[PDB]
Design an enzyme around this catalytic site. Sequence first.
Site, PDB file in Angstrom:
ATOM      1  N   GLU A   1      -5.750 -17.239  60.489  1.00  0.00           N
ATOM      2  CA  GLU A   1      -6.125 -15.833  60.519  1.00  0.00           C
ATOM      3  C   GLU A   1      -7.441 -15.724  59.750  1.00  0.00           C
ATOM      4  OE1 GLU A   1      -3.982 -13.859  62.331  1.00  0.00           O
ATOM      5  OE2 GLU A   1      -5.452 -12.237  62.267  1.00  0.00           O
TER       6      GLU A   1
ATOM      7  N   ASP B   1      -7.033  -4.063  52.311  1.00  0.00           N
ATOM      8  CA  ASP B   1      -7.133  -5.223  51.430  1.00  0.00           C
ATOM      9  C   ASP B   1      -7.253  -4.868  49.958  1.00  0.00           C
ATOM     10  OD1 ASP B   1      -7.178  -7.780  53.021  1.00  0.00           O
ATOM     11  OD2 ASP B   1      -8.780  -6.715  54.078  1.00  0.00           O
TER      12      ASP B   1
ATOM     13  N   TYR C   1       3.267  -9.046  63.833  1.00  0.00           N
ATOM     14  CA  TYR C   1       3.062  -9.098  62.398  1.00  0.00           C
ATOM     15  C   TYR C   1       4.185  -8.363  61.694  1.00  0.00           C
ATOM     16  CZ  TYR C   1       0.209  -9.887  58.242  1.00  0.00           C
ATOM     17  OH  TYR C   1      -0.295 -10.349  57.048  1.00  0.00           O
TER      18      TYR C   1
HETATM   19  O1  F9F Z   1      -1.373 -12.877  51.264  1.00  0.00           O
HETATM   20  P1  F9F Z   1      -1.976 -11.486  51.293  1.00  0.00           P
HETATM   21  O2  F9F Z   1      -1.169 -10.510  50.478  1.00  0.00           O
HETATM   22  O3  F9F Z   1      -3.418 -11.553  50.827  1.00  0.00           O
HETATM   23  O4  F9F Z   1      -1.980 -10.961  52.778  1.00  0.00           O
HETATM   24  C1  F9F Z   1      -2.927 -11.560  53.634  1.00  0.00           C
HETATM   25  C2  F9F Z   1      -2.980 -10.788  54.925  1.00  0.00           C
HETATM   26  N1  F9F Z   1      -4.163 -11.107  55.652  1.00  0.00           N
HETATM   27  S1  F9F Z   1      -4.128 -10.692  57.230  1.00  0.00           S
HETATM   28  O5  F9F Z   1      -5.277 -11.096  57.979  1.00  0.00           O
HETATM   29  O6  F9F Z   1      -2.953 -11.230  57.856  1.00  0.00           O
HETATM   30  C3  F9F Z   1      -3.933  -8.942  57.336  1.00  0.00           C
HETATM   31  C4  F9F Z   1      -3.018  -8.416  58.233  1.00  0.00           C
HETATM   32  C5  F9F Z   1      -2.870  -7.037  58.300  1.00  0.00           C
HETATM   33  C6  F9F Z   1      -3.639  -6.222  57.474  1.00  0.00           C
HETATM   34  O7  F9F Z   1      -3.555  -4.812  57.465  1.00  0.00           O
HETATM   35  C7  F9F Z   1      -2.655  -4.172  58.314  1.00  0.00           C
HETATM   36  F1  F9F Z   1      -1.418  -4.563  58.067  1.00  0.00           F
HETATM   37  F2  F9F Z   1      -2.724  -2.869  58.034  1.00  0.00           F
HETATM   38  F3  F9F Z   1      -2.959  -4.391  59.597  1.00  0.00           F
HETATM   39  C8  F9F Z   1      -4.541  -6.765  56.583  1.00  0.00           C
HETATM   40  C9  F9F Z   1      -4.695  -8.134  56.517  1.00  0.00           C
END
Ligand code: F9F
EC number: 4.2.1.20
Lengths: 265, 265, 395, 395
Positions: free
Chosen positions: B49, B60, B175
């Site tokens: 990803e 984020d 997801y």
């Molecule tokens: O391990 P962490 O806590 O840093 O999480 C990493 C996630 N990275 S990601 O690209 O999947 C990702 C997936 C969804 C996100 O926002 C949404 F849910 F609103 F769509 C943001 C980042």
Amino acid sequence: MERYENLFAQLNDRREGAFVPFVTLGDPGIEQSLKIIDTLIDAGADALELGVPFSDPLADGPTIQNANLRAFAAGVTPAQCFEMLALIREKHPTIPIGLLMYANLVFNNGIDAFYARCEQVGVDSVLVADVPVEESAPFRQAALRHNIAPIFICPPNADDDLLRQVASYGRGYTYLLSRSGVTGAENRGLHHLIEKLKEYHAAPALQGFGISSPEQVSAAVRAGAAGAISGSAIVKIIEKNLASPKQMLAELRSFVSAMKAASRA
Amino acid sequence: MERYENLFAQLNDRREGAFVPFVTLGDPGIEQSLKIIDTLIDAGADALELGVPFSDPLADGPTIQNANLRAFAAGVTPAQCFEMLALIREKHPTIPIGLLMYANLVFNNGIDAFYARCEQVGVDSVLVADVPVEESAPFRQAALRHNIAPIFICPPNADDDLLRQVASYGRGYTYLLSRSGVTGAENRGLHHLIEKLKEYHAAPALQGFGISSPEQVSAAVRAGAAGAISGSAIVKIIEKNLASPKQMLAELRSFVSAMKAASRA
Amino acid sequence: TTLLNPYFGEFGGMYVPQILMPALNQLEEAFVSAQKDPEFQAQFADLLKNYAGRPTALTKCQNITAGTRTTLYLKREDLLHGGAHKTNQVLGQALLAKRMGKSEIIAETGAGQHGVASALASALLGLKCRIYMGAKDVERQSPNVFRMRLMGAEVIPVHSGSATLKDACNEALRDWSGSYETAHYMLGTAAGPHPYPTIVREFQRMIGEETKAQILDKEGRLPDAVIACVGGGSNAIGMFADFINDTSVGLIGVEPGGHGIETGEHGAPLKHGRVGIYFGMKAPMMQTADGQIEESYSISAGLDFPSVGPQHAYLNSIGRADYVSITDDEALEAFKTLCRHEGIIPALESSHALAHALKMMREQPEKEQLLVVNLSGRGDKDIFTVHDILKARGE
Amino acid sequence: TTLLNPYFGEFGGMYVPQILMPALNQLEEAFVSAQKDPEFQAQFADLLKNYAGRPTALTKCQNITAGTRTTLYLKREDLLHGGAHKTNQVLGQALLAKRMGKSEIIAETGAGQHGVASALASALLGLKCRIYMGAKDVERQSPNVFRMRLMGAEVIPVHSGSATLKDACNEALRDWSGSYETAHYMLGTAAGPHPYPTIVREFQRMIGEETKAQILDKEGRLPDAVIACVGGGSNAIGMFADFINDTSVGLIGVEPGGHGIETGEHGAPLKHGRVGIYFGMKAPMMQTADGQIEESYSISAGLDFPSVGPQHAYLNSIGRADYVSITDDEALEAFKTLCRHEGIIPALESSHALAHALKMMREQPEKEQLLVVNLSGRGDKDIFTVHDILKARGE
Ligand SMILES: O=P(O)(O)OCCNS(=O)(=O)c1ccc(OC(F)(F)F)cc1
Ligand SMILES: O=P(O)(O)OCCNS(=O)(=O)c1ccc(OC(F)(F)F)cc1
Ligand SMILES: C=C(/N=C/c1c(COP(=O)(O)O)cnc(C)c1O)C(=O)O
Ligand SMILES: C=C(/N=C/c1c(COP(=O)(O)O)cnc(C)c1O)C(=O)O
Ligand SMILES: [N+]
Ligand SMILES: [N+]
């Protein structure tokens, strides 16, 4: 007594106006103040106007404001002022002595008692600066009861009713204000008033406020006033020479002598 | 293509969950980012990803916020990201590659053109973080037109209608959000959702947000998820070792290998 | 000779140098004429409504009286244009100035709210405004200095005496005694020589008039008491006036207790001074045994004054109104309490009135009482002062 | 699925992470229910009247239109409790929060007026309030930081990005995405995801409703135009709403021109940006060629925002409303002019609207026109900023 009456009669004979210095009692200290006053008299002062230090002197500009502050810095109190006045009168039996008072100092522990104290030390007149004729009844009554002349003000904006009241209520002399505003040599400041006062048999007029030069003294006499008062011009000489008490008295003598000379016609 | 479909079928056979690292493209620079990504893959990453740096990444937390800032400090642009993606796919023909996008970067110069570009460089999926299913029509249409899997989110507060929509509209993987809030390893974060998604024939679920340890990866697999995503935990290793690019890759390799080992059942 | 009585019992009068008596008589005549002039009254009403924002709200406290039998309303003069009640009577006096052919305005200010009011009215009505302010107040009420100067007023710091309100009053009066031909002295409180205590009351009395109407509408009865802080006395007499003949309504004025009456550092001459003559009036004042005027003290610049308006001294003497004091610390607690529990930031002056109402409630919490506090101003001018204090205490 | 239309033509929508959609749907349902609940409407009306001070005055300018054929009124939202229009809709949203069982409030603020409003409403209605504010704004609008903290709000400086309003918005939304179960996000402008642009308009629309009634009473006709500054869009849509179906009434919105549109340092995306998706909405924004969001600039913190509410973008697109810009220097001159000639110190935000009205008058001084400017706030928060500038220019 009749010290003002006797003074003006003598001046009248000699073809003279009165010159009357003002200073603040106890400025810059009691002892130097007493010397200053003796110098004023020796140099030709016909009468004295003497201020009792007051915390908030609303008719005075910065020069005499700072005279009051100097006296307070020396710890001068009204009680000490009355001791000074007694000493002055002891030395000088005939010179008229007038006080410049603010109302609260007269009112404080009894109007009658204040004027009684004035009589005891030999004061001849009291001018209460923030008491107009409209509010004057208990002051002038107490004054006359204790043989003190109550002094009132004839401003340049005086109407006929004021003129008649001032002529009737006042004794000793009538204060002829040169201008509006507050005391100050920096700000220099009428025959119709002088003539009307004489018509109503008022006490002789002394012009005051902004008089700082012999020419102004001469001019006041020429106008028909019985004399002139100078305060800030005198006080500035004190302020200028605080570190030089000997020059202070010399310059005071020179100035008073010059002002008095100009009163002679 | 069918890279996710092929991956999950292979993992299914091997009795394995997927481990999927996230990093920001171009963090801390293009060249080091490419090395990081090769290291992630060599260490056992089943899929990737990858974030395109965006000025205001609202889903984020600070760790990935600062990853975006580092890439911008290196001058990284979406154009440069697509060049990187092309190079990555050139090296690695079968690994599924998913992008983490914010809506304005997709919308900017045409939604259709964005997904067309993804197809050209060999991207397999796009997750637009601030486009809910309610607003998704032009995005998922463009995605399917260009053989890109549009990824949707099953939050812990998902109701039945959302579950059915996510199952129908999404491709590649689903997801499975671990928790509310924003990305972050500091904040650690459901069978009923996993079961319902399978009932509605949704794409296999990857759990994400707050996964930073092998135990959480194992637990996600045990729960019935097809795998787990870890971002901030990976990015922290980059941040920690900026002055030591060699240790950076060693520690990344160690961590990814450990996380992948935990996906094996 | 005057048209109206210059005295309230023994208190009041016109104790100014003779030079100023025609100016005072002129002002009195102008006021009496204006008060029966329908066009003047309409112009004044229009400014109050459409420029200043009258009527001001009457707010029922929702939280600070919980668990007691006190119902507390706040008369919201903090919502008036300028941020304090001072604006009401400045609009009236400015119209009087125009009526008298004056082109300049002199004003004194302590908290700077009267200064702000004088400046805004002068800007609106085309007058040249100069404001005397004690140098200590220039510092502790600085936001109002900025506001006055942005509206084109000349602000003159006063360093003499205590460098606070009484010293600004002194300089304003000294100025006027020389400039009355072209300047109107817009005195900012219900004190000074006649006719100012009367004029200021009449141009503030809509506070109590509105309060009476509002409390009758909301409660169907008059208040058990109305409570107001007292410096010179304008917001309090403005609240009190329309209730004076309602004998069931308590009138409670609150002077600043400063560091405590026993310290001598306070501004509570009505109850802890003695009668004197100063600032044109016979009134209670803080004075030495000798009759020198004492310097006052209050955390609040607007209450830092060693005398009090003569009508308050009179109402006290006959027992119609009762006067109390509130210390710096009591006022600070009331300030904090109103901020945090009603979302209103009060002037520190007004906080003295609120503090006393809070005492009335807390001391006797099962006493049924309907109270109104005159919230005479907002506290924006005080926020930097109050924060600095609440940092030397931790907080 | 929604109860109300989330779009205004192409603009608007609900572009938030999926996690927040139930919170938005809940808020929409709560709003629709409240809008037909007579008890909610009565509670909201009572707070507006008796706590906030509505209706606010409509002031006719007496001096600044001299020698022209312009009649200019100012709608005096500067007289509202708190000092700006922001207070209106905060009272409504706080009641909504209580209705929904929330105990905490998140808010963003730029000028600090929405922050002050959120804090005062939370203190009144018993909510725990935290406020995000850009670090640059913490400095240039410092009086409001002090006011917020004195009322018990937590003020959190934001150092990311431009350290101004957009960055406060970002952090507020990030916070809410994790805390929505117990916190209501009290968004402070007519922007963001549905239902906020709609809710904020409906809870501000009394501005225009009152203005219409007041201008009909005083002039016997509708205005030729109503003029309001536009950051996110709440005071302008609040003024505009009740006039939208009065086709003869011009609606003029004024964005900040900053140092000049040609410098790129401005906050005028409606007219000088292009459509994008950010902060939960599809709307005009300042963005790079690549689609990164640009940082805005204005001397006014409240207008320093790189997007605009979707209803304004829509009203512009169909030609119902016209949008213009005003530079820092034009706003500063309007500020000075109102201070000195009407005695009102306006917010620098509001000064942009006044500056444009002054241009309408000065450019065509024999054009007969009846104008209303929404004076959205008072300038106390700005006086230190404006003074510092008017010292680096002499003055
Ligand atoms: O391990 P962490 O806590 O840093 O999480 C990493 C996630 N990275 S990601 O690209 O999947 C990702 C997936 C969804 C996100 O926002 C949404 F849910 F609103 F769509 C943001 C980042
Ligand atoms: O020479 P200047 O200008 O300093 O004037 C000195 C005057 N000193 S004084 O005692 O006569 C004097 C006389 C009257 C005063 O006020 C009043 F007029 F209101 F009563 C004040 C001082
Ligand atoms: C000294 C001043 N203010 C006094 C004041 C006072 C005390 O003055 P009065 O007693 O005249 O109301 C009360 N409330 C507020 C908000 C005030 O600003 C002044 O602004 O000049
Ligand atoms: C950014 C803020 N204020 C904006 C503002 C604005 C611009 O915001 P709207 O476009 O939402 O009215 C206008 N007028 C005043 C007095 C303002 O305070 C704030 O207080 O958070
Ligand atoms: N007092
Ligand atoms: N905008």
